[PDB]
């Protein structure tokens, strides 16, 4: 699988040795090239995963993530074109290195064949993002933003490490294939429930879980524009991809003690969606809506119904995209006005009509309107939950109450309505914003026509 | 009929032809512990290399 790994490793000499003017022209022109190279990984067998080597392998679950990450990397490049034009060239090369290194650690992480190799490359991603969030951030609190990020993720990461080595000494291998074939029932002993607690709370923290979610509002809001998309789009989803992987040996204790988490997600998803409708900062909305959708997929894995694993993958990519346009859009209002208050800028179609067109179709994508894979994945979660419990619908049905209650709400107060006559700052839309808008939303309608590949391994 | 021993002459170490049997176990030593299992064979490459975590070699 070094088809994709090495050219990204080499991309660091590429950007570092590139000339003064190109750099970003260089950075994109080859990151797109790597994207179609990673588009090859769409070749799955039925159920036997693509085992490329002893340490690297991929399956129907990992591959959609790989294409998401690799194709994402050009997007923050062009997204960061505006924000970081003033800075000198050397840090420009360093910033791209952080982006490439981040995507580098992502692709190996999703493709590791040994659990600890996944873990070492799991939390290896906070190191570059901590640099991105803290150094290149904009507002003052960004200092405390990074601390909240790493400490939250680490507070659960270390228990996983102690658990992982324990399984190594107990079973003899943490490799996905061996642990899957030699999967054994995790008994109900108090020792084993804490083992389950160790192997789950790590992903739950950066899931996030209701109550264990403060980092995203304190990080995504003050993260740099490029950094903000990457966190929500994919760096949310390491825990998820790990979660469906480690859940092969935690049975049957999962069906017995997932209730507190199924609780905290269900109430949290309504709670997060409701508070999402009542923030004064637009950037907090995509952050709070993100966890609301993200709280949904934790429900999927807990019931571990085949249908639940169906929508877990689809919603992951769907939301992972969905947060991307909104953060891109929410960015576009910011630097134009140097504020993230939706109240300050209202009715932008009277000034930016094309931006509004992109705004609404991303919004209705967040609405989970079929045939978009946002709904079908999200819908499969509903069906699995009903199989788990018929009553489940009402609490989550309350989530199909708040989403559109806010997901069109900023539309009618950011892109829709009248304009304040004092902001002459608002200007025409540079084609970059619409162009990246095109590569952002056009895919989601494209693979909508063909949902089986991003459906997941349960096909 | 005696001779005065010369200086150093009397201090010479001497041999005695006693007929007493040799003390087989003068210290009354018991059986001693057997040695550890010795090392033998030839050094062959370690199976699957280091075998530590994910390191294939």
Curated annotation (Swiss-Prot), chain A:
The keyword Transport applies. GO terms for cellular component: mitochondrial inner membrane; respiratory chain complex I. The keyword NAD applies. InterPro entries: NADH4_N, NADH_Q_OxRdtase_chainM/4, NADH_UbQ_OxRdtase, ND/Mrp_TM. Its EC number is 7.1.1.2. It is found in: Mitochondrion inner membrane. Keywords: Electron transport, Membrane, Mitochondrion, Mitochondrion inner membrane, NAD, Respiratory chain, Translocase, Transmembrane, Transmembrane helix, Transport, Ubiquinone. Its main location: mitochondrion. It catalyses: a ubiquinone + NADH + 5 H(+)(in) = a ubiquinol + NAD(+) + 4 H(+)(out). It is a multi-pass membrane protein. The chain crosses the membrane at residues 22-42, 60-80, 98-118, 147-167, 193-213, 224-244, 257-277, 284-303, 308-330, 351-371, 391-413, 435-455. One of its GO terms (biological process) is mitochondrial electron transport, NADH to ubiquinone. GO terms for molecular function: NADH dehydrogenase (ubiquinone) activity; ubiquinone binding. Core subunit of the mitochondrial membrane respiratory chain NADH dehydrogenase (Complex I) which catalyzes electron transfer from NADH through the respiratory chain, using ubiquinone as an electron acceptor. Essential for the catalytic activity and assembly of complex I. Core subunit of respiratory chain NADH dehydrogenase (Complex I) which is composed of 45 different subunits. This is NADH-ubiquinone oxidoreductase chain 4. It comes from Sus scrofa (Pig).
């Amino acid at each position: 699988m070094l088809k994709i790994i090495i050219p990204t490793t080499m991309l660091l000499p590429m950007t570092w040795m590139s000339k003064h003017n190109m750099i970003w022209i260089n950075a994109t022109v080859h990151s797109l090239l790597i994207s179609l190279i990673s588009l090859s990984l769409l070749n799955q067998l039925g159920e036997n995963s693509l085992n490329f080597s002893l340490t690297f392998f991929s399956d129907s679950l990992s591959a959609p993530l790989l294409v998401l990450t690799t194709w994402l990397l050009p997007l923050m490049l062009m997204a960061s074109q505006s924000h970081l034009s003033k800075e000198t060239t050397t840090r420009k090369k360093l910033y791209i290195t952080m982006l490439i290194l981040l995507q580098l650690f992502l692709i190996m992480t999703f493709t590791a064949t040994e659990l600890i190799l996944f873990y070492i490359l799991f939390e290896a991603t906070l190191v570059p993002t901590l640099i991105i969030i803290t150094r290149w951030g904009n507002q003052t609190e960004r200092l405390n933003a990074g601390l909240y990020f790493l400490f939250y993720t680490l507070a659960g990461s270390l228990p996983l490490l102690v658990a992982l080595v324990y399984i190594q000494n107990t079973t003899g291998s943490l490799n996905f294939l061996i642990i899957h074939y030699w999967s054994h029932p995790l008994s109900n002993s108090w020792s084993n429930i804490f083992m389950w607690l160790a192997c789950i709370m790590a992903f739950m923290v950066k899931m996030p879980l209701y109550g264990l979610h403060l980092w995203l509002p304190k990080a995504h809001v003050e993260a740099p524009i490029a950094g903000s998309m990457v966190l929500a789009a994919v760096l949310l989803k390491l825990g998820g991809y790990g979660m469906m992987r480690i859940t092969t040996i935690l049975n049957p204790l999962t069906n017995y003690m997932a209730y507190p988490f199924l609780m905290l997600s269900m109430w949290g998803m309504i709670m997060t969606s409701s508070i999402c409708l009542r923030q004064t900062d637009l950037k907090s909305l995509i952050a709070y809506s993100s966890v609301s959708h993200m709280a949904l997929v934790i429900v999927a894995i807990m019931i571990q119904t085949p249908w639940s694993f169906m929508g877990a993958t689809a919603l992951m990519i769907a939301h992972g995209l969905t947060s991307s346009m909104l953060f891109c859009l929410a960015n576009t209002n910011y630097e134009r006005v140097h504020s993230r208050t939706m109240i300050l800028a209202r009715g932008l179609q009277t000034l930016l009509p094309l931006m509004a067109t992109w705004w609404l179709m991303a919004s209705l994508t967040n609405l989970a309107l079929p045939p978009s894979i946002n709904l079908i994945g999200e819908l499969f979660i509903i069906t699995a939950s009903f199989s788990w419990s018929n009553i489940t619908i009402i609490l989550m049905g309350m989530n199909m109450m708040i989403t559109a209650l806010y997901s069109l709400y900023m539309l009618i107060t950011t892109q829709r309505g009248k304009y304040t006559h004092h902001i002459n700052n608002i200007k025409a839309s540079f084609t970059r914003e619409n162009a990246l808008m095109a590569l952002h939303i056009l895919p989601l309608l494209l693979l909508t026509l063909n949902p089986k590949m991003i459906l997941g391994p349960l096909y | 009929g005696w001779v005065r021993p010369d200086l150093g002459e009397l201090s010479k170490v001497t041999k005695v032809k006693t007929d007493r049997p040799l003390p087989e176990n003068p210290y009354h030593s018991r059986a001693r512990p057997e040695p550890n299992p010795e090392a033998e064979g030839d050094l062959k490459p370690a199976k699957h290399g280091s075998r530590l975590f994910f390191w294939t070699m």
